[PDB]
Scaffold this active site. Sequence first.
Site, PDB file in Angstrom:
ATOM      1  N   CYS C 187      43.829  40.538  35.349  1.00 33.93           N
ATOM      2  CA  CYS C 187      42.726  39.790  34.762  1.00 33.93           C
ATOM      3  C   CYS C 187      42.938  39.370  33.309  1.00 33.93           C
ATOM      4  O   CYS C 187      43.370  40.173  32.476  1.00 33.93           O
ATOM      5  CB  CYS C 187      41.451  40.630  34.869  1.00 33.93           C
ATOM      6  N   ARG C 286      33.579  33.855  42.814  1.00 31.77           N
ATOM      7  CA  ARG C 286      33.575  35.053  41.975  1.00 31.77           C
ATOM      8  C   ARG C 286      33.216  34.753  40.514  1.00 31.77           C
ATOM      9  O   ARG C 286      32.714  35.624  39.799  1.00 31.77           O
ATOM     10  CB  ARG C 286      34.950  35.732  42.047  1.00 31.77           C
TER      11      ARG C 286
HETATM   12  N1  LIG Z   1      40.608  37.975  36.937  1.00 34.34           N
HETATM   13  C1  LIG Z   1      40.930  38.045  38.284  1.00 34.34           C
HETATM   14  O1  LIG Z   1      41.512  37.091  38.767  1.00 34.34           O
HETATM   15  C2  LIG Z   1      40.584  39.230  39.112  1.00 34.34           C
HETATM   16  N2  LIG Z   1      40.853  39.384  40.421  1.00 34.34           N
HETATM   17  C3  LIG Z   1      40.399  40.541  40.724  1.00 34.34           C
HETATM   18  N3  LIG Z   1      39.843  41.168  39.688  1.00 34.34           N
HETATM   19  C4  LIG Z   1      39.197  42.480  39.437  1.00 34.34           C
HETATM   20  O2  LIG Z   1      40.214  43.481  39.131  1.00 34.34           O
HETATM   21  C5  LIG Z   1      40.034  44.620  39.976  1.00 34.34           C
HETATM   22  C6  LIG Z   1      41.383  45.286  40.344  1.00 34.34           C
HETATM   23  O3  LIG Z   1      41.864  45.800  39.072  1.00 34.34           O
HETATM   24  P1  LIG Z   1      43.128  46.665  39.044  1.00 34.34           P
HETATM   25  O4  LIG Z   1      42.911  47.859  39.907  1.00 34.34           O
HETATM   26  O5  LIG Z   1      44.228  45.804  39.520  1.00 34.34           O
HETATM   27  O6  LIG Z   1      43.376  47.034  37.632  1.00 34.34           O
HETATM   28  C7  LIG Z   1      39.281  44.065  41.188  1.00 34.34           C
HETATM   29  O7  LIG Z   1      38.598  45.082  41.862  1.00 34.34           O
HETATM   30  C8  LIG Z   1      38.333  43.014  40.560  1.00 34.34           C
HETATM   31  O8  LIG Z   1      37.124  43.603  40.057  1.00 34.34           O
HETATM   32  C9  LIG Z   1      39.951  40.326  38.635  1.00 34.34           C
HETATM   33  O9  LIG Z   1      39.529  40.508  37.348  1.00 34.34           O
HETATM   34  K   LIG Z   2      42.964  42.744  31.976  1.00 35.63           K
END
Ligand SMILES: NC(=O)c1[nH+]cn([C@@H]2O[C@H](COP(=O)([O-])[O-])[C@@H](O)[C@H]2O)c1[O-]
Ligand SMILES: [K+]
Lengths: 362, 362, 362, 362
Positions: C187, C286
């Site tokens: 993210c 989202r």
């Molecule tokens: N920015 C993005 O494209 C994005 N895609 C998914 N996510 C978020 O990041 C979480 C997974 O984080 P992580 O476990 O990879 O650190 C997901 O459950 C969701 O809340 C994101 O922030």
């Molecule tokens: K991040």
Amino acid sequence: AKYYNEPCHTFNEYLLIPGLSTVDCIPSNVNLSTPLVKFQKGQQSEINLKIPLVSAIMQSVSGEKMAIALAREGGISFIFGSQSIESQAAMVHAVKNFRYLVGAGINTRDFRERVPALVEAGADVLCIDSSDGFSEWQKITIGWIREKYGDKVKVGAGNIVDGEGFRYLADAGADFIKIGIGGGSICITREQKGIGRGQATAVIDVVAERNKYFEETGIYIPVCSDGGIVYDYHMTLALAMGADFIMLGRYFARFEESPTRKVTINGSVMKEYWGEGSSRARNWQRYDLGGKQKLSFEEGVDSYVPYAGKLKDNVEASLNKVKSTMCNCGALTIPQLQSKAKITLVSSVSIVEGGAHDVIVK
Amino acid sequence: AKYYNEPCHTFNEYLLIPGLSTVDCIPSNVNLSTPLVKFQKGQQSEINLKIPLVSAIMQSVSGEKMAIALAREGGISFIFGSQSIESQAAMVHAVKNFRYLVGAGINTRDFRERVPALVEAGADVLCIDSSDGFSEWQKITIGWIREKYGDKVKVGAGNIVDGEGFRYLADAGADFIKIGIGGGSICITREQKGIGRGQATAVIDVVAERNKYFEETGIYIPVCSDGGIVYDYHMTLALAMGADFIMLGRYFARFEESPTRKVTINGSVMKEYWGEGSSRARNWQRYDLGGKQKLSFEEGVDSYVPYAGKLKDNVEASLNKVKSTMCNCGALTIPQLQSKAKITLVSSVSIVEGGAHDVIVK
Amino acid sequence: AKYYNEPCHTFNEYLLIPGLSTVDCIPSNVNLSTPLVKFQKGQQSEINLKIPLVSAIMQSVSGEKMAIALAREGGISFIFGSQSIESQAAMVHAVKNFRYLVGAGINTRDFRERVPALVEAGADVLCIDSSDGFSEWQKITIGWIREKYGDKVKVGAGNIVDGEGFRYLADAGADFIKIGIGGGSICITREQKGIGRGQATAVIDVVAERNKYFEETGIYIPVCSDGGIVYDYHMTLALAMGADFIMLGRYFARFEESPTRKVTINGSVMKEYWGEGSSRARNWQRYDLGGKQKLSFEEGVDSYVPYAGKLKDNVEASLNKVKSTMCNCGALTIPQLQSKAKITLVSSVSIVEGGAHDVIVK
Amino acid sequence: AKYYNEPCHTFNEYLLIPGLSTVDCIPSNVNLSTPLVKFQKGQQSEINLKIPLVSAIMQSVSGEKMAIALAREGGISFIFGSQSIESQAAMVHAVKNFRYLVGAGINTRDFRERVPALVEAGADVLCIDSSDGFSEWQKITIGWIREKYGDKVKVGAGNIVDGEGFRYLADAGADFIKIGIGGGSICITREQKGIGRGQATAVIDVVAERNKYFEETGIYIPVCSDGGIVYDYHMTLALAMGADFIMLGRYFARFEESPTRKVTINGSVMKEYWGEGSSRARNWQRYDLGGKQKLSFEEGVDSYVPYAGKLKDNVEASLNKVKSTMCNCGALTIPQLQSKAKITLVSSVSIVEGGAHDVIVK
Ligand SMILES: NC(=O)c1[nH+]cn([C@@H]2O[C@H](COP(=O)([O-])[O-])[C@@H](O)[C@H]2O)c1[O-]
Ligand SMILES: [K+]
Ligand SMILES: NC(=O)c1[nH+]cn([C@@H]2O[C@H](COP(=O)([O-])[O-])[C@@H](O)[C@H]2O)c1[O-]
Ligand SMILES: NC(=O)c1[nH+]cn([C@@H]2O[C@H](COP(=O)([O-])[O-])[C@@H](O)[C@H]2O)c1[O-]
Ligand SMILES: NC(=O)c1[nH+]cn([C@@H]2O[C@H](COP(=O)([O-])[O-])[C@@H](O)[C@H]2O)c1[O-]
Ligand SMILES: [K+]
Ligand SMILES: [K+]
Ligand SMILES: [K+]
Ligand SMILES: [K+]
Ligand SMILES: [K+]
Ligand SMILES: [K+]
Ligand SMILES: [K+]
């Protein structure tokens, strides 16, 4: 000497915590209008921009092409004053008769000759260009303008970083007050003289004083966060902290419309960008302390910034992010954002977590 | 044990926030005079420097050429005492009869012989050279001098970093008190023994006690910020924090006038510079704790610093920055600066913003 | 605007201080069960997981194989909703009739059609997938579900980072509330929009509000720490801070069961992993703010993560560390840990001391 | 959960501020004696070391040669217990009949057999070797020893990091309590399990509780700062903070007397040094939580440390620095230092100033 309870901070250390977004909080419904000059409670400013962005009073930024392009998008440029009165007046005249709004920078020395020429050319607003505007020199300049033109001529002033400085220029009669010392991308004043303050802390402090001043006098003085904007979200932060508009140099220098040359450095197309305090610009008036009419030493550098294309496309992209964030915060106008914003400082470890981490970006 | 509410800080963490600059705040009108020795309220010090810079009591810094060159510019050098009494007296004599002011360092062991020799040679002021001056040894030394010469001989003392240390040496009769432990560029005391304090915090704390002492006794004791000066703006900060004058080693070691050899290291002309606590200097008296007449272990290093040219040109350039900043702060004298200064701590992110950023410096 | 007394922090800045370990504090006696949906004081949740781990609502994470493998180990997966209703329903159906528990993500736009299809397919619980869940859109979605299914259908919601957001979604009727904005490994929202908060601070703040809400209403709402988990001990910290369960993306994307391809990058076997906000996923719902049905700009990246093998083996290894730590803290259940945990922030220098140091690791 | 007002800190963040040094504050007059086991107010400990240094209960540190060499210099070694009872007893016996003092580590499992064997061999003191000593297992072990030997056998215990842990082991009957979790040079517990605390903060907190306990019961329990000592001045800091003695692993592993092999790595002579929690040592008892008799996962690493020569020469050099600093602080004994010490935290910028800076070290 006087000390403070907390150290100063700047943009990269902050984040906005979203508030309630209603169904009407749609980016397309966001109004980015903002006042440019002081007005009385209950009333509207005589000059309102459609977007809160203004270009820096710099040779490498605010030329004729920049002024026209930014005015078209709803902002305003302040034609640089580090040039002859005649040439600056000519630039202002060309923009006004290309009606697009246009500003012009002035200094605390030749204002008796420069101001009349700029007013004659059709400048909509003026702004004293000084590194440290907390001075009697600015008070004298503003006083002369008021003496000769009353409230007909609008003049911005300063570059102060605390309540005391704001108060001084407000009482002096400034129509808007610029905030910031040393935060500029090409500025090395803080390393050469040891003066300045983190841009965010400066904005927050000045805004607090501005609001007290408003309650006391019924006069609302717009303030400008000048310098230090690196990322688009920094714009949103500056506005949320209370700034009515933002002055940028580097941001605009990267565009096709900036008056500088495009140069290729290591396979990358760049644009020239230099500080007014560099030997290249020689804008000694900006750092004038009543001494010799020359730059005592450099306070800015000569550099290159990445070419980013046309102003229109970039400004559109930047503001789309600003509007989107404002909606996350439940705001449809800048005053709403300034009222509803929830702003927190962020630890260095939290900063690491904020970017991509523990993955190989493809 | 005793603990503190806040951690100590030093120069690189601070910035000055400009105050009002009046039309008379011109660099050329700035008076850099400063008292060297204690005096009574309402009166003037018997010794006033024209500039607040003094060279360190070091073999690699304060020789005859340095003393003459710095005296010519308005400061004073303290001829190093880590040499025979005869040779040090000869250096002092040569400077006095080259009238230029000159100081001389002494230690807490052979003062009964060294002091008379130095007074005879014409030294204007003396200074005990010790890493940790909070000791009965310094009190004994000062007491002997007072016993034999009364107030005719001026003697600086210490190197304390808090109010308690200052108070002890003040009551002991010191004419000026030196501040700082471990901040020296070539010092590794803090890493070898674990004693010391951030230079800025030390100056601020000592100055606070010095001002209380003044109000209590009517006696103003000048204090010296010794060590840690890296950039010219650090000088302004030290003075603003309350220091009357600044002692520097590295700053002067780089000049043509320093008694060391110029050496080329990787295409760069350098000058030798070593600590009094290095095996090269063997100044064991400076770290003496009543033990054997030898260095128990090293507390300083042998090094090279960039050659900067002539003292006159460099000092002129440095002080022009100091005077300019003082004007931004609305001060025309050091006492004015110390009264008007607004000093803030700066976050690490704000520090990054203070230098050039997000541009490729050409 | 509103400001805070302290900056936000995240996982890497914390450590647990062990409490008393009794003879019964054996890892084998630790019960990792945890409630998934809200329940009344004195009662049990209608859905309890055997382990507090749930997989992210992402295309590159929660597919059929992942859902089955994680359900087998005691957790639950939320089949990604960034696909057609028909295909998502098919995935849910396949898992339910492979009885394994399975969840499914929904959005605030097509819920009138997606929800019935998912309920029909046999989904045990739903969860609104939104970057910023503090919105009327989520309230409307939850309200519709309650209107049509009452309490028969369980729906998680949000991704808020403070008490205000939690309170809003709790009053809206959410069965569980997800915490976290910008902490995800892939993210870049915090760098694109400037919104977010350190994951740890967010969990701690939300949990405090959740506990007040419980005392006020007698209703216990489970909360989920979503994103930012890098090391196994981060799981323990999140739970100790009050989170009932943890949602992870990166952690699971590395396993054989994730729906992505294994690719070799520089002699290392990796797996594809991308954010829902990347151009690859195009999950505009989202980040929907009532605008156009498209991604205004990227808020996530496309990347590679190290291949870690089978989920079963990795989850076993991770939880063995969690259980061991819980025993050091004297806890045999998650509620016990949340009650007994002693949590401290750690200085950067202390962090260095925490890893191997001053030795060459063989 | 429970939180704290301040983050934890460790050695590198502190400095001692010198107090008054009297003429009798000579390094040669410093007495480094210190109590090893608890005693009643007004009395002396039954075991007093001549120097406050003890070697770690590790395979790669405390063998027969180390025990003899350290005992000769005034300290004591704790023969490692991660070996058969028979072989450990043999080592203790060899040292006792080489009278040199010697300690021996024990665990919370086979103490019924190991203790009698060690007492029989002539061990002067025992010490439970555990990562997390805040447990009923240690209370049971100490209780058994008291049951069978009363006060005739001395047993150290723990490794706690706060007042609660200290209190528990004190009430349990421990003769001395060891402080520290995760600070060891070869320890990765804080990164594997997320438990621990900055070593300095731990010592300071435990000492505060120890002093309250003393006032309450009239019983003085010596405490040991175990792990994290990197520089000689760290020793002085630990003692000043209240520790009666210091346990070191890395420090001693570098000496000729350590039981490991000398190996050349890149032209540098090194010595092997590994943690008890590494697969090489397999000291599972140290991390035992009532589970299987095996290491669940590694909490330590296998490494190399620089060869430093003979223990005698190194210990002499280290303590000369300690004694010198004590004199700067006006202390001639450890209790005096603990009473007179003035300890401050240091900013990161102050840390930079503390070392050599802005010079090229020759
Ligand atoms: N920015 C993005 O494209 C994005 N895609 C998914 N996510 C978020 O990041 C979480 C997974 O984080 P992580 O476990 O990879 O650190 C997901 O459950 C969701 O809340 C994101 O922030
Ligand atoms: K991040
Ligand atoms: N130091 C200099 O030479 C200098 N020249 C221009 N500026 C300031 O830096 C601002 C532009 O900053 P930035 O947008 O490039 O970061 C200008 O508006 C002006 O206030 C400077 O600080
Ligand atoms: N440690 C040493 O060997 C040593 N030798 C000299 N000094 C100190 O460092 C000061 C010079 O510091 P600096 O100007 O080089 O940073 C001297 O005035 C003296 O107080 C030292 O600390
Ligand atoms: N994690 C491990 O494997 C381990 N092995 C030994 N130790 C601890 O680390 C201490 C030695 O630390 P140090 O002096 O090397 O920094 C020992 O006294 C013990 O408390 C460990 O933490
Ligand atoms: K929102
Ligand atoms: K000023
Ligand atoms: K700058
Ligand atoms: K425990
Ligand atoms: K460690
Ligand atoms: K002292
Ligand atoms: K130093």
